Amino acid sequence: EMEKEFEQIDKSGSWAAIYQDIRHEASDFPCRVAKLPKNKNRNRYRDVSPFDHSRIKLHQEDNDYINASLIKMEEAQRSYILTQGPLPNTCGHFWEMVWEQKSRGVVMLNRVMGSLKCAQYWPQKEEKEMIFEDTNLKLTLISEDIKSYYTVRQLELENLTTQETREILHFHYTTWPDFGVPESPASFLNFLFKVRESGSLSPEHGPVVVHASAGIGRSGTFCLADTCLLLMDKRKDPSSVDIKKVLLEMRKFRMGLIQTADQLRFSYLAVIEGAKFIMGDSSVQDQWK
Amino acid sequence: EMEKEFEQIDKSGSWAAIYQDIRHEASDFPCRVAKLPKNKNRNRYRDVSPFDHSRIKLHQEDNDYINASLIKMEEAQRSYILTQGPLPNTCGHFWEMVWEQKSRGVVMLNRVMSLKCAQYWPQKEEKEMIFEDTNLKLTLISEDIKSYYTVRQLELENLTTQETREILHFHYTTWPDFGVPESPASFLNFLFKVRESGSLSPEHGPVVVHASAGIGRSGTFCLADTCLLLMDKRKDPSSVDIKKVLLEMRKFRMGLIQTADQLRFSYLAVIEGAKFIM
Amino acid sequence: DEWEVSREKITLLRELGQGSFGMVYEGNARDIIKGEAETRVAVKTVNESASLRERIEFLNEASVMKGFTCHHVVRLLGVVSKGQPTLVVMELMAHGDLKSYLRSLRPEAENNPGRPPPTLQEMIQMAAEIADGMAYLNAKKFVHRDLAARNCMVAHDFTVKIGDFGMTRDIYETDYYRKGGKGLLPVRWMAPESLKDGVFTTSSDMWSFGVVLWEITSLAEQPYQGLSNEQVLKFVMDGGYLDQPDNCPERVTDLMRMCWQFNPNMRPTFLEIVNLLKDDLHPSFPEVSFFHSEENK
Amino acid sequence: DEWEVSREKITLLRELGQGSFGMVYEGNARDIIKGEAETRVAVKTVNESASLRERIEFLNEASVMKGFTCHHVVRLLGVVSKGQPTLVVMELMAHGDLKSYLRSLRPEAENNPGRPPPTLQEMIQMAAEIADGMAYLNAKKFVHRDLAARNCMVAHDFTVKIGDFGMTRDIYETDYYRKGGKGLLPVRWMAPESLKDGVFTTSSDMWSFGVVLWEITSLAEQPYQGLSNEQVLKFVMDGGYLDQPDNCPERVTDLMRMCWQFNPNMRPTFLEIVNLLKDDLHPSFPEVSFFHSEENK
């Protein structure tokens, strides 16, 4: 039972211990390509690399490398792509990936202060479209809705080679510090639901692309919480979902997901608050009490 | 009549003019004694002197002069003694007068907070005062400090006869020289407290009234009291002529009421006080 | 707080008119002044729609007045802060605020108090009484910022007193106050440097004093009638000033002139104003003024 | 006022506890944060028995918070000044005030939040967070004057934040504030110079900071328990100070010793405190601290 597990961990002050176990039990796979000399400038951090088996391969003969991982969650029936904040020289690759994987949405979690650990890869003005000559792509801002702690942008991505166009919804949560946690579980859940509402996470489209700076801490929290909510919703017994086990599964696709014990605790916190109404196997009368 | 007159003067803005006529029509009587060379040090102001016919005479062989006047209002049936604020050298004379005239009360109107008056009464019960020149003793028996006035109970003793008398001292503290009271209500409240004390009773000698010169604020106080008395003694109160009552009072002491504003206030106070005693 | 008065002691009798932040009422207060069973007073309140800033100044006025003692400054009597509504109790000024009083003296007034308009001698007296109160306020190291006929009161003997300090600020450390943010301001009573940089001093207060003399000589007419606020704002900052109302004594015009010097350093101080007028005042003036008091050193 | 919020959008759900001037409630606010339909908030109100000064301070707190933007300072969300009661709406801090939080962690606690007492690392972290918020406040030229565990708040992730400014004073011009008249003071948290001469500076705030560390290490025990205020006053002015709570970590003790130096110019600054703890803090500190921000120049 997730909730009782939470209270027991809190009561015994075990968060650090649990997180330590998760790290010790986490999957370890080769990252040969990411460590290739020709890819030194395609990585934002020397200590954050995508496993060779789950890395996203760009469809180009030049150099198919990008620091991005495909996280496929079979039981949840949702896939996500986690990547680092694009670099000045990798903005074209970022969009090529978006195009090639048929993604409809991008989730950004960099904190707007100051300067972001992410290059400016999207247009600031509708009238100033962006052209990535290296990958033959054009990107135009169609509309932008700035709100209190997040901003939603509508973008038109055009493959200049085929003249085909796609609408990309870009969601940027602006009040989440690196290595930290959201202002509150509720604002985080409000953001998660806005993204779900857009249809960007639908099975009909390619995997949603999620990033921040490294693409493991905040990016991992976002995906873990979403997956646990999915599993709890399609399971006869919500309480049977084991977050620790879900995180370890996810870590099979990308290293270091969830960077701190606090982020681990927050994930539990948000999942529990977001699962408050999932009935499960209870009856109308029981769910009333 | 009275109230309609008041409004009539206000409408035409004639207060200065009406006050001017009063000064022109006022009595002019001899002040020979007050102007004697040996009395200069007994007068606070050169331009304020008691008429010879109505001056208070001290019952002593030395020098019987004091700057004080007996104002006897026959119709109102009340007498008042108006005097200047005593000087350091006339404090003994002041009490000799209070004793010889059998006054029961003193009304002081000097503004508090450097008075144009000498400290003629004890500041503490334990520090009584003795006036050697007139052989008198004064002791503070009780003092009740209020917001704008103070009421003191004093025991005056004629040391020559060892006889004792209780004197009530009333001090209105918020009346500036040449000015008017903060309000007609506070003024009237003070007047009524003095009346209630019994100090203005006919069984007693004249109440002694003073400030600095004993004509401006002192005159307003007496004019107002007298006009209220007169109104009480008539079937028709509004028929009292404040201007005439003042000229009558001016037969006994010069300059009663120093400004047209004090004249206006008197009307206000008398009109408001009347509607109160009725 | 020794200024706290128990609510039941105060009875609101009627409305006297709108003040800076709310309706001002005439009330009857039982035993609030030792020696007097009942006292007529003025009671200030704040409207329900008052903003935070307005509510803050309303309360501030009560707090600052606690430290004032000047014949030409309305006196605070107490406060009813226990429960709502909050009440600020002050001495009752028989003839109301200077602006209303002035207007009721117009030939076409409907509430005429049966008295004619102010003579030259009265105008000068008022000028000196207001300057004295301001001189006192400045000596306490406060800048008024909102000097106007509406914020002055008239007593039973027509003495004028400063009675509203809704915008007053402390200037002990610098001798001036600068307007940081925004907010509604009385543009027709503001000095050029105040309209431009939002800087307020005893000198910009002097500018306002001149407009009050203008209000007096015109019986509370609107300053710069015929111009909008935007035009006034631009007109004053460009070196323009009020004209002389018909029948405005020449001697009073000379006072206004010196209050409307574009350079604040050229304007006289309130103590200078009083000194200038001292030989043409009522006999009681030296008895009550701050100017002649020992505290003015 | 861009901060004014419609009363109809606020619903008080339950009492959270007594604050500086009145009951603090937990409320639900609809449409006060763009992009968020409903927000759980904390609503401050003032008791009906509040004095004039208290009311002024309550409104004043709301006014100064409008200009604060610091991760370690409770955020203001809005105000309801239209009608009564006045409401000050702020971000809700999941674990309430630090004093209540600490006491609920005692072994005998009946309302235990289901978590163990703070470790040394958690204490250092709290120290740096509070010091960061204070460094920010001082850079904005305010003296807090009332730093105490009860005036700090705890978030869902346990981040501590300064949440009360009932006695805060501007020190832009002089860098200090001297108490004029008399008043009620938090004697047990005051520096000797503030007790003796009513002088408040960032140094006296540092003294209070030391008492807050004492509160943290003793789980909100009462400072100088067993001694009256009169004895505390005499004791501290004579050079005395609090004993190190039993089993208090030495790293923290070293901090209090610095804060409780009799001479105010001998006490470290808040920035110095943070700089002192900078290498033993959570990975996110540099991302949100005032200390590491570009604003700290």
- Distance of alpha carbon A256 from alpha carbon C134, whole angstroms: 71
Same-domain status, D97 and D243:
yes
Q: What's the CA dihedral at B246, B251, B257, B258 to 10 degrees?
A: 140
Determine whether A137 is exposed, middle or buried from the number of CB atoms within 10 Å of its CB (0-12, 13-18, 19+): buried
Q: Is B63 helix (H, G, I), strand (E, B) or coil?
A: coil
Could you tell me if B2 and B240 are in contact, meaning their C-beta atoms sit under 8 angstroms apart? yes
- H/E element, B208: strand B207-210
Put simply, the chain C residues between 175 and 234 with a CB less than 8 A from any chain B CB are: none
Taking Cα atoms as reference points, which of B210, B140, B217, B212 lies closest to residue B179?
B217
Same-domain status, D132 and D77:
no
Same-domain status, D207 and D103:
yes
Same-domain status, D128 and D258:
yes
- Distance of alpha carbon D31 from alpha carbon D13, whole angstroms: 17
Could you tell me if D167 and D225 are in contact, meaning their C-beta atoms sit under 8 angstroms apart? no
- Distance of alpha carbon B28 from alpha carbon B30, whole angstroms: 7
Query: ∠ CA B160-B166-B167 to the nearest 5 degrees?
Result: 105
Last residue of a domain, one of D38, D73, D92: D92
Taking each helix axis from N to C terminus, what angle separates A185-198 and A218-233, rounded to the nearest 10 degrees?
A: 70
Distances (CA, A) of B151 to B114, B171, B194, B261, C37: 20, 6, 9, 27, 16
Q: Which backbone phi and psi does C77 adopt, to 5 degrees?
A: -110, -30
- Distance of alpha carbon C20 from alpha carbon C99, whole angstroms: 13
D279 touches chain C (CB under 8 A): no
**Nearest-by-Cβ selection for C82 from D1, D49, D174:** D49
Task: Give the helix ranges, DSSP H, for chain B.
Answer: 2-12, 15-25, 91-100, 184-196, 216-232, 242-249, 260-277
Across C131-246, the runs of DSSP E, i.e. the strands, are 142-143, 152-154, 160-162, 169-170, 177-178, 199-200
User: By residue range, what is the domain housing residue C280?
Assistant: 93-295
DSSP C165: -
At A67, list the tokens: 């620091």
- Distance of alpha carbon B97 from alpha carbon B55, whole angstroms: 11
For residue A167, the cross-strand partners are A156
Minimal C-alpha gap between B176 and chain C (Å): 6
Distances (CA, A) of D143 to C107, D172, D178: 57, 10, 11
Q: Is D11 helix (H, G, I), strand (E, B) or coil?
A: strand
At B117, list the tokens: 């008056």
Cis amide linkage into residue C85, ω under 30° from 0: yes
> How long a stretch of residues is chain D?
297
> How long a stretch of residues is chain C?
297
Q: Which backbone phi and psi does B106 adopt, to 5 degrees?
A: -130, 135
DSSP D278: G
Cis amide linkage into residue C283, ω under 30° from 0: no
- Non-local (6+) Cβ contacts of A193 within 8 A are none
> How long a stretch of residues is chain A?
289
The CATH number of whichever domain residue D242 belongs to comes to: 1.10.510.10
C59 touches chain D (CB under 8 A): yes
Taking Cα atoms as reference points, which of B262, B233, B268 lies closest to residue B246?
B262
Taking Cα atoms as reference points, which of C10, C1, C165 lies closest to residue C85?
C10
**Nearest-by-Cβ selection for A148 from D35, D293, D294:** D35
For residue C275, the cross-strand partners are none
DSSP string, C214-261: HHHHTTSPPTTTTS-HHHHHHHHHTT--PPPPTT--HHHHHHHHHHT-
Residue of B nearest to C118 (CA): B13
Domains of chain B: 1-278 (3.90.190.10)
Q: Is D92 helix (H, G, I), strand (E, B) or coil?
A: coil
Same-domain status, C153 and C289:
yes
Which residues of chain C are within 8 Å of residue D49 when distances are taken between CB atoms?
Answer: 82-83
Q: Is B277 helix (H, G, I), strand (E, B) or coil?
A: helix
Which residues of chain D are within 8 Å of residue C62 when distances are taken between CB atoms?
Answer: 52
DSSP string, A97-147: HHHHTT--EEEE--------SS---S-SSTTS-EEETTTTEEEEEEEEEE-
Distances (CA, A) of D146 to D188, D201, D212: 11, 11, 11
Q: Which residues of C form the catalytic set?
A: 146
- Distance of alpha carbon D122 from alpha carbon D133, whole angstroms: 17
CA-based end-to-end distance of chain C: 31
Residue of C70, C115, C129, C157 to mutate for B, most B C-beta atoms under 10 A: C157
- Distance of alpha carbon C39 from alpha carbon B273, whole angstroms: 15
- Distance of alpha carbon B171 from alpha carbon B169, whole angstroms: 7
- Distance of alpha carbon C140 from alpha carbon C11, whole angstroms: 33
D64 touches chain C (CB under 8 A): no
Same-domain status, D73 and D122:
no
- Distance of alpha carbon C218 from alpha carbon C216, whole angstroms: 5
Could you tell me if B199 and B168 are in contact, meaning their C-beta atoms sit under 8 angstroms apart? yes
CA B20 to chain centre: 22
Cβ-based neighbour number of residue C226 at 10 Å: 7
Distances (CA, A) of A58 to A98, A203, D75: 10, 21, 45
Are D35 and A149 a contacting pair at CB < 8 A?
yes
Could you tell me if A238 and A225 are in contact, meaning their C-beta atoms sit under 8 angstroms apart? no
Q: Is B105 helix (H, G, I), strand (E, B) or coil?
A: strand
Taking Cα atoms as reference points, which of B74, B99, B50 lies closest to residue B205?
B99
- Distance of alpha carbon B231 from alpha carbon C137, whole angstroms: 45
Across C46-140, the runs of DSSP E, i.e. the strands, are 76-80, 87-91
Could you tell me if A55 and A33 are in contact, meaning their C-beta atoms sit under 8 angstroms apart? yes
Across D114-210, the runs of DSSP E, i.e. the strands, are 142-143, 152-154, 160-162, 169-170, 177-178, 199-200
C180 touches chain D (CB under 8 A): no
At C169, list the tokens: 């600020």
Structural domains counted in chain C: 2
Same-domain status, D173 and D249:
yes
At B200, list the tokens: 């203005």
Distances (CA, A) of B218 to B71, B174, B185, B256: 12, 14, 17, 8
DSSP B114: -
Query: ∠ CA A232-A234-A240 to the nearest 5 degrees?
Result: 40
Could you tell me if A87 and A41 are in contact, meaning their C-beta atoms sit under 8 angstroms apart? yes
Could you tell me if B137 and B163 are in contact, meaning their C-beta atoms sit under 8 angstroms apart? no
Same-domain status, D228 and D125:
yes
**Nearest-by-Cβ selection for C288 from B11, B145, B176:** B176
Taking Cα atoms as reference points, which of A153, A158, A159 lies closest to residue A141?
A153
Same-domain status, C142 and C262:
yes
- Distance of alpha carbon C11 from alpha carbon C41, whole angstroms: 10
The CATH number of whichever domain residue D42 belongs to comes to: 3.30.200.20
CA-based end-to-end distance of chain D: 31
D275 phi-psi bin (left φ>0, alpha ψ -120 to 50, beta other): alpha
- Distance of alpha carbon D137 from alpha carbon D216, whole angstroms: 21
- Distance of alpha carbon C26 from alpha carbon C11, whole angstroms: 9
Q: Count of H helices and E strands in chain C?
A: 9, 11
For residue B164, the cross-strand partners are B157
Query: ∠ CA C53-C57-C61 to the nearest 5 degrees?
Result: 175
Which residues of chain D are within 8 Å of residue A260 when distances are taken between CB atoms?
Answer: 282-284
Please name the residue that has the structure tokens 């005693």.
B277
Q: What's the CA dihedral at D277, D280, D285, D291 to 10 degrees?
A: 20
At D29, list the tokens: 């606010």
Distances (CA, A) of B119 to B85, B108, B214, C216: 10, 12, 16, 44
Residue of D28, D31, D157, D291 to mutate for A, most A C-beta atoms under 10 A: D157
- Distance of alpha carbon B71 from alpha carbon B228, whole angstroms: 16
- Distance of alpha carbon A287 from alpha carbon A280, whole angstroms: 9
Read off the amino acid at residue A55.
R
Could you tell me if B56 and B81 are in contact, meaning their C-beta atoms sit under 8 angstroms apart? yes
Taking Cα atoms as reference points, which of A213, A196, A90, A205 lies closest to residue A152?
A196
Are B147 and C119 a contacting pair at CB < 8 A?
no
For residue C17, the cross-strand partners are C24
- Distance of alpha carbon B66 from alpha carbon B58, whole angstroms: 7
Taking Cα atoms as reference points, which of A118, A120, A158, A163 lies closest to residue A142?
A158
Taking Cα atoms as reference points, which of B261, B243, B107 lies closest to residue B181?
B261
Which residues of chain C are within 8 Å of residue D60 when distances are taken between CB atoms?
Answer: 56
Chains that touch C (3 or more CB pairs under 8 A): B, D
DSSP string, chain A: -HHHHHHHHHHHT-HHHHHHHHHHHS-----TTTTSGGGGGG-S-TT----TTTBPPPS-SS----SEEEEEETTTTEEEEEEPPPPGGGHHHHHHHHHHTT--EEEE--------SS---S-SSTTS-EEETTTTEEEEEEEEEE-SSEEEEEEEEEETTTTEEEEEEEEEE-S--TTS--S-HHHHHHHHHHHHHHTTT-TTS-PEEEESSSSSSHHHHHHHHHHHHHHHHTSS-GGG--HHHHHHHHTTTSTT-S-SHHHHHHHHHHHHHHSTT--TT--HHHHH-
Same-domain status, C24 and C50:
yes
Please name the residue that has the structure tokens 């001189």.
C135
Q: In what order do the strands lie in the sheet with C23-33?
A: C10-18, C23-33, C36-44, C87-91, C76-80
D280 is in an annotated binding site: no
Distances (CA, A) of B75 to B209, B249, D291: 20, 11, 90
- Distance of alpha carbon C115 from alpha carbon A202, whole angstroms: 85
- Distance of alpha carbon C139 from alpha carbon B60, whole angstroms: 53
Could you tell me if D267 and D203 are in contact, meaning their C-beta atoms sit under 8 angstroms apart? yes
**Nearest-by-Cβ selection for A178 from D157, D284, D293:** D284
Last residue of a domain, one of D38, D69, D92: D92
Which residues of chain C are within 8 Å of residue D52 when distances are taken between CB atoms?
Answer: 1, 3-4, 59, 62-63, 79, 81
- Non-local (6+) Cβ contacts of C80 within 8 A are C4, C5, C6, C7, C10, C86, C87, C89
Are D284 and A186 a contacting pair at CB < 8 A?
no
- Distance of alpha carbon A50 from alpha carbon A29, whole angstroms: 9
- Distance of alpha carbon A130 from alpha carbon A123, whole angstroms: 6
Could you tell me if D65 and A179 are in contact, meaning their C-beta atoms sit under 8 angstroms apart? no
Chains that touch B (3 or more CB pairs under 8 A): C
- Distance of alpha carbon D210 from alpha carbon B33, whole angstroms: 83
DSSP string, B228-250: HHHHHTSS-GGG--HHHHHHHHT
DSSP D159: -
Q: Is B70 helix (H, G, I), strand (E, B) or coil?
A: strand
Taking Cα atoms as reference points, which of D152, D287, D122 lies closest to residue A15?
D122
Read off the amino acid at residue B123.
Q
Same-domain status, C102 and C195:
yes
Q: Is D148 helix (H, G, I), strand (E, B) or coil?
A: coil
Taking Cα atoms as reference points, which of D127, D155, D284 lies closest to residue A183?
D155
Same-domain status, C88 and C191:
no
Which residues of chain D are within 8 Å of residue A271 when distances are taken between CB atoms?
Answer: none
Last residue of a domain, one of D42, D74, D92: D92
> How long a stretch of residues is chain B?
278
Put simply, the chain D residues between 19 and 58 with a CB less than 8 A from any chain C CB are: 48-53, 55-56
Taking Cα atoms as reference points, which of A106, A144, A180, A270 lies closest to residue D35?
A144
Could you tell me if D296 and D139 are in contact, meaning their C-beta atoms sit under 8 angstroms apart? yes
- H/E element, B65: strand B65-73
Tell how strand A164-173 and strand A208-211 pair up: unpaired
C292 touches chain B (CB under 8 A): no
Q: Is C122 helix (H, G, I), strand (E, B) or coil?
A: helix
At B199, list the tokens: 């100090």
